[PDB]
Amino acid sequence: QCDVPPNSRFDCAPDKAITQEQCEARGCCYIPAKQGQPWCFFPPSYPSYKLENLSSSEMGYTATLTRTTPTFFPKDILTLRLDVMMETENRLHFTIKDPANRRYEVPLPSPLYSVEFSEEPFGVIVHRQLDGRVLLNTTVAPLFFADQFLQLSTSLPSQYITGLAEHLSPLMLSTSWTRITLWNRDLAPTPGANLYGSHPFYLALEDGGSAHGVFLLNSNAMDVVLQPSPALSWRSTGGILDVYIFLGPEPKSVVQQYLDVVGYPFMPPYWGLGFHLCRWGYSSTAITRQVVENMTRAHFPLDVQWNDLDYMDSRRDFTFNKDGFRDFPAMVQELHQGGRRYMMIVDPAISSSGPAGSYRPYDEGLRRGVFITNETGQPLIGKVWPGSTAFPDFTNPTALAWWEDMVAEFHDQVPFDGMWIDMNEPSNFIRGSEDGCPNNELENPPYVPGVVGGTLQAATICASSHQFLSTHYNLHNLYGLTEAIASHRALVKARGTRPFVISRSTFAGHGRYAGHWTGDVWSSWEQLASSVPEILQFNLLGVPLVGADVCGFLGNTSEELCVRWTQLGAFYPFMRNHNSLLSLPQEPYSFSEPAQQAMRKALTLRYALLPHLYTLFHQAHVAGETVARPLFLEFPKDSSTWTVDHQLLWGEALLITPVLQAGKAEVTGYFPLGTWYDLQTVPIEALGSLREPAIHSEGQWVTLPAPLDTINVHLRAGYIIPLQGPGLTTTESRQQPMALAVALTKGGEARGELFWDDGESLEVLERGAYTQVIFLARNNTIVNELVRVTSEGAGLQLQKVTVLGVATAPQQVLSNGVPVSNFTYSPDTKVLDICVSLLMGEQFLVSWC
């Protein structure tokens, strides 16, 4: 009766350390491990819920779940309602609720699946129809459903699972008794800790390269426990079970299906894709001006200048000091005149200690009741940068209106172009509030997940504090998201163009409103390597605008690290070099000449690829694609890709293989079956100063030369990449002529596309205010296909076409039937470089033979 294989034992004492006698008193089995694995675990006979009165609606199924025997947790809910909705052929949805009490809910020719049910103990069983494989089986363990404790378990189809941000972890999560805690927390990224965001979604790989996704729409603090059987357990501290299963079958389709629910990523302004430079310690407008001066002097592109707490008056939002920032508005106006943009930090917490009538944001907040309140109904007061602070309630409609006003009013003073929203966990320098926290079940729940500090209050506000929609206990994981939403709306109203919001704390669906950076990472090799899986993870979760502080934030960077970090960083979708107050400088211009070359080259390449990167974001926005993706998302059927997370793809075509260790002059990367052209063979122009031509892989690891000044970038055969000429800003580069890089298959074919708009307007797709072109290479010709042409893309000039993998030197190269003025061919590299005078918006035919 206690004969359960070790790896299939489910913890019967997740709440406390337990003795044998107590374990058996709970009706559980006690077997000590031989070396983690629970000593106290459920027998197959442990009391669960029983399914009864299962019936058939038009949507799917409904049933009653009854528990006869109470668990060891208080306030078991003995009668539940089951609703199974078969929403699409790709998406199955089921809820388990209390029919007697409305509980907290997060405010949001055949199907590929089939569903069965176990009667006793109750379980939901989901099969993939095509191959009969069990994806979900909740029978593996008892269902717990108490007021402050939900537990739902399932078998997993393989050892390969990804998701459940935000943690410093490999892309593929360890199934060796791993406890993953989702509770937004201000902590410098470290393994085994709950970090800034919570995304209750996983993608699971199945033998053969199929995949499915599971999303649990629950914003309460939770643990997810993985075991090697393999299996998974959700343990939430409130709410309901609201489960979506996405059937794929392709990993890309899983992501797309998940984003159908949580929302497709927002479309950033083009300039957002440029280089961002920031640090804490630009303490004046004069110093800040020097940063732009020094970058321009040394031919480093810079699109956006940022400021941290420096700009503020006494570290308060919506103010500027009259010392080093007396002429703040003029500085920002000047940046605009140069064709650049400005970003500055904004905290959620509002200074409450000022004299009445002297600080409008607090005074208005007080008047309108925008703050999170405590037991007696007064604002909850914590400590942050300005000192004593109240925290806005972003679930309050009135709070949203107040936030819009503060942003609009401040924008009238200083025309910033976006918002960097930090500390939105929300972060608190003290535990709970200045007045401590009350003694109640929200503050001391029966189950506390493995959060750092061992309490839900650590580094945040009281769980039992009041918001418009609910207690903080339920809403905590949404705090950052709600601020993102609030900020997104505020910037739209204030500016009338696309918002640019970068947020620290995030939740499922965050990517629809804002981007993210991975927080206070150390300037270390370890942290540089870790950023790749982290960036990839966020793409899978539909937050494609993500990156890490290039060169690292905490500690002092080295020259070598900063070179490697910039090399890889240029391939973060969101690229910002940011630095801490006490750190040594790490701006590109602050290093030696050889190092500057390497960095200049990385920034040059990025700027060249912006038209491509922008098109990739367009795909994310309309079709729920990823921008930076792991090999396994592009090559699921090659199981060698499954554990690759130190390389990344941009879209389908561009494979980046970075050096992530000190003193390395080579890198070993994995190349899926196909031909991969070295991007070094494509001519790229720069403003300042700055190997096999092709890899023919059978699906194998390849060692590549990787000297200090090189980052390995390969273009997949059969793909056409659009490029644009150089500039120090996107204002400049968007005016430059364009080029094509054409990577021919052995069969002489290739396909590509370009999306183009004004780069900042709202409702571009709805209004049709864009140009969309497809490029096709076939039978020794390159043509364009006009999907849509408007004034926006009309005057785009194509002046250069580079063809990779041309076997023999041509005798004639024609453009629209006339010999071109100039072309070159390398017998060595197999590259045909053609000069042309064409318009992206007019049909052309380039040919050779």
Ligand X SMILES: *[C@@H]1O[C@H](CO)[C@@H](O[C@@H]2O[C@H](CO)[C@@H](O[C@@H]3O[C@H](CO)[C@@H](O)[C@H](O)[C@@H]3O)[C@H](O)[C@H]2NC(C)=O)[C@H](O)[C@H]1NC(C)=O
Ligand Y SMILES: *[C@@H]1O[C@H](CO[C@@H]2O[C@@H](C)[C@@H](O)[C@@H](O)[C@@H]2O)[C@@H](O[C@@H]2O[C@H](CO)[C@@H](O)[C@H](O)[C@H]2NC(C)=O)[C@H](O)[C@H]1NC(C)=O
Ligand Z SMILES: *[C@@H]1O[C@H](CO)[C@@H](O[C@@H]2O[C@H](CO)[C@@H](O)[C@H](O)[C@H]2NC(C)=O)[C@H](O)[C@H]1NC(C)=O
Is 519 one of the binding residues for ligand A1IO7 (CB under 6 A)?
yes
Residue nearest to ligand X (CB): 378
Peptide bond before 249: cis, by omega within 30 degrees of 0? yes
Residue 407 · residue 487 · CB < 8 Å: yes
Number of residues that bind Cl ion (CB under 5 A): 11
Among 121, 238, 624, 718, binds ligand X (CB under 6 A): 121
Name 338's Cβ contacts closer than 8 Å, sequence gap at least 6: 292, 729
Q: Locate tokens 């029919």: which residue?
A: 99
Region near ligand X per CB under 6 A, out of 90-98, 137-145, 315-323, 717-725: 137-145
**Environment class of 298 (CB within 10 Å of its CB; exposed 0-12, middle 13-18, buried 19+):** middle
Q: Within a 10 A sphere around the Cβ of 819, how many other Cβ atoms?
A: 10
b/e map 74-108, b = 16+ CB within 10 Å: eeebeebebbbbbeeebbbbbbbbeeeeeebbbee
Q: Within positions 547 to 586, which residues make up the interface with ligand Y, using CB under 6 A?
A: 555-556, 584
21 counts as catalytic? no
Q: Which residues partner with 92 through β-bridges?
A: 86, 245
Is 208 one of the binding residues for Cl ion (CB under 5 A)?
no
Q: Locate tokens 């303490």: which residue?
A: 283
When the beta carbons of 67 and 516 are compared against ligand Y, the nearer one is: 67
Please tell me the number of Cα atoms within 13 Å of 494 on its side-chain side.
Answer: 27
236 vs 702: CA distance, rounded Å: 44
Strands (E) located in 500-647: 501-503, 515-517, 546-547, 575-577, 628-629
Q: How far is the CB of 289 from ligand Z (least distance, A)?
A: 8
Find out whether 578 is annotated in a ligand binding site: yes
Among 8, 37, 64, 296, binds ligand Y (CB under 6 A): 64
Q: Within positions 44 to 103, which residues make up the interface with Cl ion, using CB under 5 A?
A: 72
115 vs 136: CA distance, rounded Å: 9
SS3 at position 138 = helix
317 counts as catalytic? no
Instruction: From the list Cl ion, ligand A1IO7, ligand Z, none, pick the one residue 711 interacts with, judged by a Cβ distance below 5 to 8 Å according to partner type.
Output: Cl ion
Is 29 one of the binding residues for ligand X (CB under 6 A)?
no
Length of the chain: 849
Q: How far is the CB of 504 from ligand A1IO7 (least distance, A)?
A: 6
Q: Within positions 420 to 449, which residues make up the interface with ligand X, using CB under 6 A?
A: 435
Is 59 one of the binding residues for ligand Z (CB under 6 A)?
no
The side-by-side arrangement of strands in the sheet containing 149-155 is 144-146, 149-155, 231-236, 222-227, 178-182
Q: How far is the CB of 287 from ligand Z (least distance, A)?
A: 5
Q: How far is the CB of 828 from ligand Y (least distance, A)?
A: 45
**Environment class of 357 (CB within 10 Å of its CB; exposed 0-12, middle 13-18, buried 19+):** exposed
Among 164, 309, 343, 508, binds ligand A1IO7 (CB under 6 A): 309
Binding track over 414-433 against ligand A1IO7, x by CB under 6 A: --------x-----------
Is 376 one of the binding residues for ligand X (CB under 6 A)?
yes
Residue 74 · residue 145 · CB < 8 Å: no
414 phi/psi in degrees, rounded to 5:
-135, 110
Among 45, 701, 822, 837, binds Cl ion (CB under 5 A): 701
Among 62, 95, 118, 294, binds ligand Z (CB under 6 A): 294
Is 552 one of the binding residues for ligand A1IO7 (CB under 6 A)?
no
Find out whether 336 is annotated in a ligand binding site: no
Q: How far is the CB of 461 from ligand Z (least distance, A)?
A: 37
Q: Supply the DSSP string of 579-610, one letter for each residue.
A: --TTSPP--GGGS-HHHHHHHHHHHHHHHHHH
Q: Within a 10 A sphere around the Cβ of 342, how many other Cβ atoms?
A: 21
Q: Within positions 66 to 95, which residues make up the interface with ligand Y, using CB under 6 A?
A: 66
Is 483 one of the binding residues for ligand A1IO7 (CB under 6 A)?
no
SS3 at position 224 = strand
Is 291 one of the binding residues for ligand Z (CB under 6 A)?
yes
Is 45 one of the binding residues for ligand X (CB under 6 A)?
no
Is 177 one of the binding residues for ligand A1IO7 (CB under 6 A)?
no
17 vs 13: CA distance, rounded Å: 7
Among 520, 534, 732, 760, binds ligand A1IO7 (CB under 6 A): 520
Is 415 one of the binding residues for Cl ion (CB under 5 A)?
yes
Is 290 one of the binding residues for ligand Z (CB under 6 A)?
yes
Q: Which residues partner with 800 through β-bridges?
A: 739, 835
Find out whether 308 is annotated in a ligand binding site: yes
Instruction: From the list Cl ion, ligand Y, ligand Z, none, pick the one residue 37 interacts with, judged by a Cβ distance below 5 to 8 Å according to partner type.
Output: none
Q: How far is the CB of 559 from ligand Y (least distance, A)?
A: 12
State the catalytic residue, choosing from 317, 422, 443, 560. Answer: 422
In 3D, which of 213, 164, 729, 166 has the Cα closest to residue 503? 166
183 vs 201: CA distance, rounded Å: 14
Is 189 one of the binding residues for ligand A1IO7 (CB under 6 A)?
no
394 vs 775: CA distance, rounded Å: 46
State the catalytic residue, choosing from 425, 483, 534, 760. Answer: 425
When the beta carbons of 113 and 149 are compared against Cl ion, the nearer one is: 149
Is 345 one of the binding residues for ligand A1IO7 (CB under 6 A)?
yes
842 vs 61: CA distance, rounded Å: 55
- CA distances (Å), 44 to each of 117, 121, 149, 231, in order? 17, 9, 21, 15
Number of residues that bind ligand A1IO7 (CB under 6 A): 9
Among 33, 59, 130, 287, binds ligand Z (CB under 6 A): 287
Find out whether 520 is annotated in a ligand binding site: yes
Q: Which residues partner with 381 through β-bridges?
A: 390
When the beta carbons of 51 and 335 are compared against ligand X, the nearer one is: 51
Q: Within positions 494 to 513, which residues make up the interface with ligand A1IO7, using CB under 6 A?
A: 504
For the CA atoms of 604, 609, 614, 619, the dihedral, rounded to the nearest 10 degrees, stands at: -150
Q: How far is the CB of 579 from ligand A1IO7 (least distance, A)?
A: 8
Binding track over 363-392 against ligand Y, x by CB under 6 A: ------------------------------
Q: Within positions 534 to 563, which residues make up the interface with ligand X, using CB under 6 A?
A: none
Sites of contact with ligand A1IO7 (CB under 6 A): 280, 308-309, 345, 422, 504, 519-520, 578
Sites of contact with ligand X (CB under 6 A): 44, 121, 125, 134, 137, 139-140, 374-376, 378-379, 381, 435
Query: Which residue ranges are tagged as binding site?
Result: 308, 504, 520, 578
The residues carrying an active-site annotation are 422, 425
Query: Which residue ranges are tagged as binding site for substrate?
Result: 308, 504, 520, 578
Sites of contact with ligand Y (CB under 6 A): 52-53, 64, 66, 555-556, 584
